[PDB]
Amino acid sequence: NDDCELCVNVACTGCL
Numbered sequence: 001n002d003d004c005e006l007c008v009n010v011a012c013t014g015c016l
Contacts, residue, residue, distance in 0.1 A: 004012035 004015060007013070007015035
Protein backbone atom coordinates (compact mmCIF):
# COMPACT_ATOMS: atom_id res chain seq x y z
CA ASN A 1 0.00 0.00 0.00
CA ASP A 2 1.07 3.67 0.10
CA ASP A 3 1.91 3.42 3.82
CA CYS A 4 5.40 1.91 3.52
CA GLU A 5 4.00 -1.42 4.80
CA LEU A 6 6.62 -3.29 2.76
CA CYS A 7 9.85 -2.46 4.63
CA VAL A 8 12.21 -4.40 6.92
CA ASN A 9 10.48 -2.87 9.95
CA VAL A 10 7.68 -0.38 10.76
CA ALA A 11 9.17 3.09 10.18
CA CYS A 12 9.77 3.33 6.41
CA THR A 13 13.44 3.23 7.45
CA GLY A 14 15.38 0.29 5.99
CA CYS A 15 13.04 -0.79 3.18
CA LEU A 16 15.11 -3.27 1.16
